Amino acid sequence: MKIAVLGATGRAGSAIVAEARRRGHEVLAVVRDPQKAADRLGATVATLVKEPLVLTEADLDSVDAVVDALSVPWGSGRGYLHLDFATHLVSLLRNSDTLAVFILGSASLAMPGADHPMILDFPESAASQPWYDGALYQYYEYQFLQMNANVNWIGISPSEAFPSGPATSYVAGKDTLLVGEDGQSHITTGNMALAILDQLEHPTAIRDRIVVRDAD
Amino acid sequence: MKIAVLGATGRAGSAIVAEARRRGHEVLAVVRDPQKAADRLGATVATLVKEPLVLTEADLDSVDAVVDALSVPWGSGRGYLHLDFATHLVSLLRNSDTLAVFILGSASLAMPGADHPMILDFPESAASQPWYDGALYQYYEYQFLQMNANVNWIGISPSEAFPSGPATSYVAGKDTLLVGEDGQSHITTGNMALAILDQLEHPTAIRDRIVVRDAD
Ligand SMILES: NC(=O)C1=CN([C@@H]2O[C@H](COP(=O)(O)OP(=O)(O)OC[C@H]3O[C@@H](n4cnc5c(N)ncnc54)[C@H](OP(=O)(O)O)[C@@H]3O)[C@@H](O)[C@H]2O)C=CC1
Numbered sequence: 001m002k003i004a005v006l007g008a009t010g011r012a013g014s015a016i017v018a019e020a021r022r023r024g025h026e027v028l029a030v031v032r033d034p035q036k037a038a039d040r041l042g043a044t045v046a047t048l049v050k051e052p053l054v055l056t057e058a059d060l061d062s063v064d065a066v067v068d069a070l071s072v073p074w075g076s077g078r079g080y081l082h083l084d085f086a087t088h089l090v091s092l093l094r095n096s097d098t099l100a101v102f103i104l105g106s107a108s109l110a111m112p113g114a115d116h117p118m119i120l121d122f123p124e125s126a127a128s129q130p131w132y133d134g135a136l137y138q139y140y141e142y143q144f145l146q147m148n149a150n151v152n153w154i155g156i157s158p159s160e161a162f163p164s165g166p167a168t169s170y171v172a173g174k175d176t177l178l179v180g181e182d183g184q185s186h187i188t189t190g191n192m193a194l195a196i197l198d199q200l201e202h203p204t205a206i207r208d209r210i211v212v213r214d215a216d
Numbered sequence: 217m218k219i220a221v222l223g224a225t226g227r228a229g230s231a232i233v234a235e236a237r238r239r240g241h242e243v244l245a246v247v248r249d250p251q252k253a254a255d256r257l258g259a260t261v262a263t264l265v266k267e268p269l270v271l272t273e274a275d276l277d278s279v280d281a282v283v284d285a286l287s288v289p290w291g292s293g294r295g296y297l298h299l300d301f302a303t304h305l306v307s308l309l310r311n312s313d314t315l316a317v318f319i320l321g322s323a324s325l326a327m328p329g330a331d332h333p334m335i336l337d338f339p340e341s342a343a344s345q346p347w348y349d350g351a352l353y354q355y356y357e358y359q360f361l362q363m364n365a366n367v368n369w370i371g372i373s374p375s376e377a378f379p380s381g382p383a384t385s386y387v388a389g390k391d392t393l394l395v396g397e398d399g400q401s402h403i404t405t406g407n408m409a410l411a412i413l414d415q416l417e418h419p420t421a422i423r424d425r426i427v428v429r430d431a432d
Pocket residue numbers: 006007008009010011012013032033036051052069070071072073081103104105106107138158159160161162
């Protein structure tokens with residue numbers, strides 16, 4: 001199948017591009033940095049150099065799936081982009097069969113033993129932390145997705161830690177932070193890539209959100 | 217000031233353009249039908265012939281305010297456009313002073329006396345009505361707007377009925393359906409235009425939603 005990867009030059013994105021190619025899919029890497037694309041993805045990966053917010057329906061009409069691996073640096077003040085990229089992507093998928101996987105945040109997950117997103121219980125002081133702006137808008141991105149019953153979107157949240165690393169295996173859940181045998185909560189970029197491509201090839205979480213951690 | 221009107225050729229839109237011109241503002245009417253613009257707005261009103269979803273930041277950077285007067289016909293299945301047009305517009309207003317007024321729906325208002333949006337209480341049968349699709353997505357549009365604490369958006373809901381007619385005066389509320397001395401709930405296209413231009417000239421409802429009905 002043909003897969004457009006938004007944020008293809010990123011940590012999650014580049015891992016997704018590699019896993020996609022391993023699995024025999026045609027990749028279109030949407031990028032702003034051709035050099036980064038040449039170095040991280042390889043000369044052989046097809047490229048569309050365009051601002052994500054300016055992508056059109058035509059840009060996406062040859063593709064069977066889209067993966068949103070875009071992010072926003074902490075302390076930029078531009079956490080709203082998490083939301084804007086997603087709303088824009090959804091707007092291009094109206095009346096289309098196209099699968100769209102969105103990587104979400106950990107803050108929209110429940111703590112173990114809770115029944116609601118942990119961000120709701122954050123202290124007022126949290127808004128002063130550089131990570132909050134992005135966490136808030138990814139929580140909103142998650143809520144926005146649920147407004148769309150007629151688009152083939154899939155949400156996947158990382159565990160608390162999202163380090164770079166090769167794939168091994170992953171364990172999946174629904175809305176609650178997962179903790180492994182080591183008492184920690186982490187997923188590698190490689191294992192997130194496995195989970196994403198797994199859903200693309202066999203969608204089980206359409207219009208739902210899952211969370212993934214590294215297996216033990 | 218310079219005001220861009222989306223849905224300028226519509227019932228609400230054309231009334232808004234008129235009131236804007238009466239009040240000495242420069243109007244940019246975003247339209248898809250030039251002949252309709254010529255007939256309803258006048259040879260004298262500047263036009264931008266473009267799909268709202270492809271409007272750019274540059275299109276809007278001379279404007280001081282934008283008014284969303286777009287709608288979707290009943291039974292089209294395209295009620296999602298209420299949301300898509302609003303999410304696109306918001307994306308263009310990031311880090312700008314520009315005032316954006318969004319005409320919302322009555323379904324996100326409480327019935328007189330209730331403490332919650334009336335749509336939450338609709339029976340299951342409601343979803344079979346041709347008005348529901350649009351109503352649902354305008355409730356979502358209202359919710360989406362509240363995700364955006366750093367944009368100068370203003371929400372205005374009509375009363376239950378939104379007939380064409382000239383301005384007289386209006387009465388404003390917050391989140392509850394308003395009923396006049398006739399026992400009815402209605403606002404004319406002309407009175408909505410008064411309310412919108414009032415907010416543009418003296419914003420009192422920034423990042424808030426008001427409701428308006430025709431005065432007695
Ligand atoms: N524990 C958790 O919940 C956390 C969740 N995550 C999430 O995972 C996802 C992927 O994260 P990650 O792989 O580390 O991110 P990266 O920081 O590696 O960069 C992601 C992509 O975003 C692109 N990009 C960033 N800003 C813009 C913009 N303004 N215009 C255009 N493109 C842009 C970058 O382009 P370029 O390469 O050219 O710079 C890059 O390709 C995100 O949703 C992030 O929030 C990440 C960390 C942990």
